[PDB]
Symmetry: D2
Subunit: 380 residues, 4 copies
């Protein structure tokens, strides 16, 4: 029996690698994806072999991540519960996609991940796995073992020679998420110094910085006149937005499995892209199309948040969003200053910005008012 | 014939007052509402009499404005096309409501206003009027007169004794709007010094300021522990957020009459309230309720923007929003700093948050069954696709 | 330990009553609700006591069923996946509501039902139970026992001395549902003579029959001029519609649990009410209100179907639907003929219909301006396409 | 100048053709489209030349109508206000399309139609024309002439010389619409013998008739095993359904221009197609995709009804509906009997139905976990209410 483990190189997946070998008397193939966490994945791959993996794989997936998951999501204007730009949410389908592919190639009957039984990640990983390979076997150790606390887990790792290192973090090219520990009290502000991807607004440059972002067909293709690949472009905007402290959100969200959770997120590049997109859309999209689009975005957002990426509903809505986004061609000009992003200009080759006479308005108004006047007369 | 004119006190409504009297051989009753435009309404009232009004009425409607129009709208989370908090939009129904009221009291068969034929305000004024008094006659001079240019309008004014004087502004307790002129080029950043209600972030305090807003039943009732009436509360938050340069928006919007236009808005108090409201809702509203509510907010926003305030669709949706909003009770803690509003905390008497469920309602294993069932249709799809 | 069992009086809940006693060694309180199954619940109550119940309760809930469940649902125009009027769906919450009431009165820590692990009813019973009493314990024998076949169950019944006798059916005041067995093949028409509530259309009267239904406030209050209580009214329309074979539908629906299921339903009275309601609404509801209401109906429907009756989302939407329904006052005249229901007329005290607006409230030029304004964005669009 | 006139060959467009020759003294080009009105279109073309038309054109557009307009609409499951299948609505864009095409080919500056200023047709014609050629000049005689009454028009006709003859009719391959006259009273049943396309239910065969419709990637491609082109297929289903009296609807609808109107429609073929489609969808579409699609259908319906066919909103939604419809491949079996259509069977090569998931990937106990997790937020809510 072989098992493809989503291995991040940390303590838990290291413990998991050992636990899987003994518990399932299985050969474990480790997989570590480079999605912009800011770590040398090769070090994780080598730790996996030291830990006991029969094979360890590491892949640079930053470009596939931005082009095939982040970009399509952004085209939809996806925002969960008013603020969450879904940084962790869209990255999970990508990881599981490769787990299942590797499982196929290696002849493995199962896959494993270290997401807990109380979060969203477990759902995202498994819904994707099942959607792509229906008879795949999934093993989620957190829902199968009986560790009674951290102490017991550190003891288990020390016993296997696994080296042992106030909140939980998840970082990738789109954002860095923070939750748990001290963050659990929604009345308490995050502690100073917690953020890593964005500069503290109180420490941002004293002068504002202008940035231009070009969109061609619904996707951003250039920054300040320089054409950049998907991953390179997000990276650049992260650098630019980050220096100014842009993209910080603090919310109490509703998880898919039932409870509320306090989360903090920094999405510098994606936040600039959100406003840049809407800026270009303001000139290229039709009024009714836009209004219909905005009423569907929230639904799309929850699909991503819940884990229904490789699902027919999401694919169907994507057909609508992509259609609409094809008209988003132009340039947005933004002004960045101490934590904030300001749209300051926009232009487009086929802008709809700027015939009748005042007289037509009276008619328009009379007809629009008819049903209201009738209703009024009936009330008498 | 009597005509009740929505009189702002400026050049155009003064020109209109004289124009109406002669064109319609009627007497004009001028109505000026104080909705926080930062001017002395009694001066417009007196100017109306000097311009020829048979009667001039001026009313302080700040409290009614915020209590009966702004609060109801905020309750619904209304936001037009992603950023417009509807500052000018919700004020129009209030004005027209009083116009129709005064017309009935004065025995006036018609009402008038100085909104142009190419904007949204004309629709808001008239849809409200017709909805409240179906037989009312509406006179909109811009759509009727033969004035050809500004030059001629000035000559007419000067001939009639009316005193004469880079963009058009509309200010009230909720915001200040700027559009037209130099703002007509969507690629040009607005001019320096344009903003009035808010301080440029570059000049905002170096020290962030914490502000707490208490919501009792969907509406804000206190700021930093001090109980304030609707208008006093909005005023307070404009002062606080204004100093920090909060609430600035720059957008190209879609007008109801069919064309796009570049608008700039500063809504300090309203912006703080928008995020404060959502902060309290994050603890007091159910997941499914919240998601449904957010999908209807945009529709409600276009209704307000188009002018369908006193319309059945709007009142029906208001029943939904008011039901949901009744649960919004708690306190939001925000951090203001150079143009931004950061939510840093929230608490509520009946908060649905239980860290009991997040720290390390079921045991992990229940999650497996949940996933299996949720995945069934997807697995079936995959098997069929073979 | 005490366990309140939702007892229908059939073979399975009889086997379950025994099973609960043996498995848990608890006192079992059988509850049978009369919701129009066309069964004498007092027989079931007696059989329950014979089967071993420590206490058996039988309540007539026909009026509560229609008044507090069917009517609120009908006001929303709830229809699941194009054709399902939710007959079985709205009944479950009522039953679970009493199961928990009784458990609390008797001091029973648990409730039990005989819905299987493959369907929707399990979710409906349990979601309302947990929603009303969060610490209640639920026992669903179908998900806990070892019986591996029908034959095994019958033997267990005999070994326990319980009386023993091509599809499963569920009947109540709203409809009769048929699914399973021969019906599992979606390409096979239901067998002849299966329907029980409606007469076969080929055997229905040769002369159409006219019926009028009065609505006052969103709910039906009279049939052919006779005031009738909710349950009596639904009963009456079932008699009238059934005689004509009205209300039959055949669909393959999506269960909440993931798979498709072939179901057949007969809802005579409800079908008449569905069309009668829309008929009165056509004169009493505003265009925009109607269009908005219709786009929310499908959502409310899935909530009911899934089992989210005592859920904040449903109660929120209910506030909207109730608000809109308050105007539905008038009379619908329908024609019934061999399985079909035809709306032939409608009237209302405050009908918004006006023949003068259509007979050959504005002049022709108004329409021209309306069209021009509506066309503006389309023309700018074509011009840019150039 | 040149004017292209949408000419139906009837009294009014004949009067309109003269009116155009006299008033504008222009060269009128008549255009008559054959879209299944069952009216020898060539008769209409000769009469146009006989009336002063310097050129009359007649085209067989039946196939284009069904393939490019009816099918895309049905693909979306479009239904206006619960019953209207949009028969007249989708035909108008097709006509205006050719008018504008012919105007470009004839160097004509304007186009004209005889829809009145009180209905929706004028909007459909004009929105289509403006969207296709923003520069186009439109002339709507009903809104421009001085005639008051039939008497007046009648004499004017005799005068110039035009043959001269209870409700108004509009017929095409999809349906026949009836409204006006005796139909204006919402309480008055339609007059016996009014219907033309459908046999009276009471006069329909005593024996039910089964029919099968095959769908391929969203569109009907065969009936009872015989492959038929779009127009031939709709024609065939009209014949089969008509003989049984299928597809009759009687409603009071909300017109786009503001007033309610009583309309009667018979859509035999289209009605069979509506139920056949949903039947194939019940096996080929995913639950969540279906539920989403149905909540959007109504919006697409009003877009068609209002006249926004060649509009970005409609084309955008079309991309969604087209994507979803591509999966609709299979066969539906329906039973026709005296005015009703009953789905009795359905099958598909890629059916998502699995008898094994329902008969006695699925484990009963997974349902408990599913239920507990779904119940969590409801339990927390209840506990907080203490
Ligand atoms: N970059 C990655 N490549 C492969 N799998 C990943 C990757 N990142 C996260 N995962 C999966 O996600 C789980 C991580 O959830 P997370 O909250 O980040 O926990 P963790 O405590 O950091 N794991 P570890 O780093 O081994 O201590 C891991 O158990 C992995 O299965
Ligand atoms: N506070 C108010 N009281 C009464 N009527 C008002 C008030 N504010 C605005 N209006 C109406 O709205 C129109 C104003 O449109 P707006 O763009 O503000 O023009 P204007 O510049 O104010 N007119 P004027 O100031 O008289 O030259 C006026 O013509 C009034 O009819
Ligand atoms: N009228 C009722 N009163 C109380 N409980 C009911 C009633 N009707 C249905 N139930 C509940 O619903 C379950 C019925 O599921 P169903 O598929 O109809 O099975 P069943 O065949 O009726 N059981 P039985 O009649 O005992 O053989 C029962 O187990 C009850 O818990
Ligand atoms: N088959 C067609 N070909 C071209 N234009 C048409 C056609 N059918 C309808 N129209 C247009 O639609 C208008 C008809 O509206 P309708 O209510 O059918 O009136 P009408 O009574 O049929 N006109 P007429 O037949 O000339 O007496 C006509 O003025 C035409 O411009
Ligand atoms: N494994 C993690 N640390 N992920 C944190 C959760 C991210 C965020 N709560 C989400 O639902 O996307
Ligand atoms: N009279 C005015 N200055 N009105 C300004 C328009 C405000 C904004 N464009 C709106 O439509 O609400
Ligand atoms: N116990 C029963 N036989 N129930 C009938 C099932 C009813 C229908 N399929 C529903 O899900 O509501
Ligand atoms: N030309 C006609 N008589 N058309 C009848 C209008 C049909 C239907 N009421 C509609 O709005 O489409």
């Amino acid at each position: 029996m072989k098992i493809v483990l989503a291995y991040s190189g940390g303590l838990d997946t290291s413990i998991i690698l050992k636990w899987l070998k003994e518990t399932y008397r299985a050969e474990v193939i480790a997989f570590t994806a480079d999605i912009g966490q800011g770590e040398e994945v090769e070090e994780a791959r080598e730790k996996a072999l030291r830990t006991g993996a029969s094979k360890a794989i590491a892949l640079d997936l930053k470009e596939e991540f931005v082009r095939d998951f982040v970009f399509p999501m952004m085209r939809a204007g996806a925002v969960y519960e008013g603020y969450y730009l879904l940084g962790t949410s869209i990255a999970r389908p990508l990881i599981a996609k490769h787990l299942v592919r590797i499982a196929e190639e290696e002849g493995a009957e199962a896959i494993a991940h270290g997401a807990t039984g109380k979060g969203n990640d477990q759902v995202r990983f498994e819904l994707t796995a099942y959607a792509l390979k229906p008879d795949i076997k999934v093993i989620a150790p957190w829902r199968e073992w009986s560790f009674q606390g951290r102490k017991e887990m550190i003891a288990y790792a020390e016993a296997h020679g696994i080296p042992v290192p106030p909140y939980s973090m998840d970082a990738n090219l789109l954002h860095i998420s923070y939750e748990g520990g001290v963050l659990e009290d929604p009345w308490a502000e995050p502690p100073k110094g917690m953020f890593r991807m964005t500069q503290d607004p109180e420490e941002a440059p004293d002068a504002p910085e202008y940035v231009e972002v070009e969109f061609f067909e619904g996707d951003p293709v250039a920054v300040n006149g320089e054409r950049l690949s998907p991953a390179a472009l997000l990276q650049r905007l992260n650098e630019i937005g980050g220096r100014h402290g842009v993209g910080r959100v603090d919310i109490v969200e509703n998880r898919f499995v039932g409870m509320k959770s306090r989360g903090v997120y920094e999405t510098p590049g994606g936040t600039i892209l959100y406003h840049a997109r809407r800026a270009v859309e303001s000139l290229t999209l039709d009024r009714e199309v836009l209004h219909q689009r905005d009423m569907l975005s929230p639904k799309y957002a929850e699909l991503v948040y819940y884990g229904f990426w490789y699902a027919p509903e999401r694919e169907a809505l994507q057909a609508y969003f992509d259609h609409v986004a094809r008209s988003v061609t132009g340039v947005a000009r933004l002004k960045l200053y101490k934590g904030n992003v300001y749209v300051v200009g926009r232009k487009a080759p086929k802008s709809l910005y700027r015939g009748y006479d005042q007289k037509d308005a009276e008619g328009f108004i009379k007809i629009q008012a008819l049903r209201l006047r009738v209703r009024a007369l009936v009330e008498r």
